[PDB]
Amino acid sequence: MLRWITAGESHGRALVAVVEGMVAGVHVTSADIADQLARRRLGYGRGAERDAVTVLSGIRHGSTLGGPIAIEIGNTEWPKWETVMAADPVDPAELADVARNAPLTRPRPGHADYAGMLKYGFDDARPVLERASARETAARVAAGTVARAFLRQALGVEVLSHVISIGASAPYEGPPPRAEDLPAIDASPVRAYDKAAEADMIAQIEAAKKDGDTLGGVVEAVALGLPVGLGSFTSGDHRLDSQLAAAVMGIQAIKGVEIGDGFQTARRRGSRAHDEMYPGPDGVVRSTNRAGGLEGGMTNGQPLRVRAAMKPISTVPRALATVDLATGDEAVAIHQRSDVCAVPAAGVVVETMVALVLARAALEKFGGDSLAETQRNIAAYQRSVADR
Numbered sequence: 001m002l003r004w005i006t007a008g009e010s011h012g013r014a015l016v017a018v019v020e021g022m023v024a025g026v027h028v029t030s031a032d033i034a035d036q037l038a039r040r041r042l043g044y045g046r047g048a049e050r051d052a053v054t055v056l057s058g059i060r061h062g063s064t065l066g067g068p069i070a071i072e073i074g075n076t077e078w079p080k081w082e083t084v085m086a087a088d089p090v091d092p093a094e095l096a097d098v099a100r101n102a103p104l105t106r107p108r109p110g111h112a113d114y115a116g117m118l119k120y121g122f123d124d125a126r127p128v129l130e131r132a133s134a135r136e137t138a139a140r141v142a143a144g145t146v147a148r149a150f151l152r153q154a155l156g157v158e159v160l161s162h163v164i165s166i167g168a169s170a171p172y173e174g175p176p177p178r179a180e181d182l183p184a185i186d187a188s189p190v191r192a193y194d195k196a197a198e199a200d201m202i203a204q205i206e207a208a209k210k211d212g213d214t215l216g217g218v219v220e221a222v223a224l225g226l227p228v229g230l231g232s233f234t235s236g237d238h239r240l241d242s243q244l245a246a247a248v249m250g251i252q253a254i255k256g257v258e259i260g261d262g263f264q265t266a267r268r269r270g271s272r273a274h275d276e277m278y279p280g281p282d283g284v285v286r287s288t289n290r291a292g293g294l295e296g297g298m299t300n301g302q303p304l305r306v307r308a309a310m311k312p313i314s315t316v317p318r319a320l321a322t323v324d325l326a327t328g329d330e331a332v333a334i335h336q337r338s339d340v341c342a343v344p345a346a347g348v349v350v351e352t353m354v355a356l357v358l359a360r361a362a363l364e365k366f367g368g369d370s371l372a373e374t375q376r377n378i379a380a381y382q383r384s385v386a387d388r
Contacts, residue, residue, distance in 0.1 A: 144352030178296025260292020
């Protein structure tokens with residue numbers, strides 16, 4: 001069972017990612033990981049630090065060892081926080097002299113702050129904020145890089161994502177491949193695949209920058225080259241729909257996920273809602289992918305299309321009323337990040353989450369303890385589906 005855990009406060013020493021149960025023999029390197037971390041930093045309208053990667057375990061000579069892979073990602077400006085976020089006790093008196101340590105008692109609407117303080121009995125939002133914050137996705141993406149290596153090397157599968165709307169842009173139609181990642185990604189100020197939508201999004205972000213507001217948007221991860229039968233219909237939770245929603249919707253500020261045409265599907269008629277099958281020079285072929293690559297909770301060979309709706313994460317500078325849990329009096333929420341928009345980055349985080357799940361799925365189906373073995377089981381399975 002592929003498994004991934006994330007550790008770190010956004011201002012703490014470093015983040016760790018640990019990925020348990022990846023097979024031996026997958027080619028992955030520090031630089032692979034830095035690369036993804038770098039794509040995590042894409043996209044104009046962000047806040048938003050050099051993410052020094054050190055692989056601590058589980059990889060040797062660029063090849064996974066099979067045991068837990070720990071990747072530590074440095075938090076660049078930690079010397080600033082060595083006291084406020086020291087692991088060890090620090091004399092309360094010299095802590096008192098530290099502005100940075102001032103307590104944080106106005107929860108920001110939209111954030112963990114208020115709930116988390118109540119939940120944990122904190123008098124301060126710092127310990128919530130510090131874990132809750134999206135800096136954590138950096139760790140996610142690190143662990144991501146392993147799934148994505150695996151998924152490429154074992155299945156020839158590629159995961160990418162591309163922004164379908166930011167703010168109030170008119171949403172985009174029809175997904176990129178593999179080959180357009182360079183433009184969508186980097187290239188695009190907004191990780192837009194489509195020229196027009198790009199312009200409309202950038203326009204929005206502009207306008208939101210001008211108004212000093214923040215935007216969310218919708219991003220679409222696309223996984224290509226998936227074999228049929230990953231995931232299962234045997235339990236609700238084995239459905240890939242379920243697993244992928246859990247992983248995508250567990251991303252900070254994701255308030256919605258849909259598979260393929262999702263909510264729009266729910267408005268169509270059965271006659272126009274699914275992906276008819278026709279015979280194909282070799283295997284069934286479909287001409288639509290409304291289902292986004294999942295039917296019955298399993299991959300049907302079509303592109304997996306998973307879309308997350310990200311609410312705007314950055315608190316709007318002076319606009320959001322809240323309560324000061326010190327006082328009990330009204331207050332405004334102090335922002336803590338500066339992004340007008342993080343949707344493009346969120347895309348790449350969605351890729352991470354999708355990749356992680358796909359890899360776990362793939363490993364559940366094909367098991368194996370080493371890539372070569374997993375590969376042999378994939379080949380057998382593919383050769384056997386080809387029969388027919």
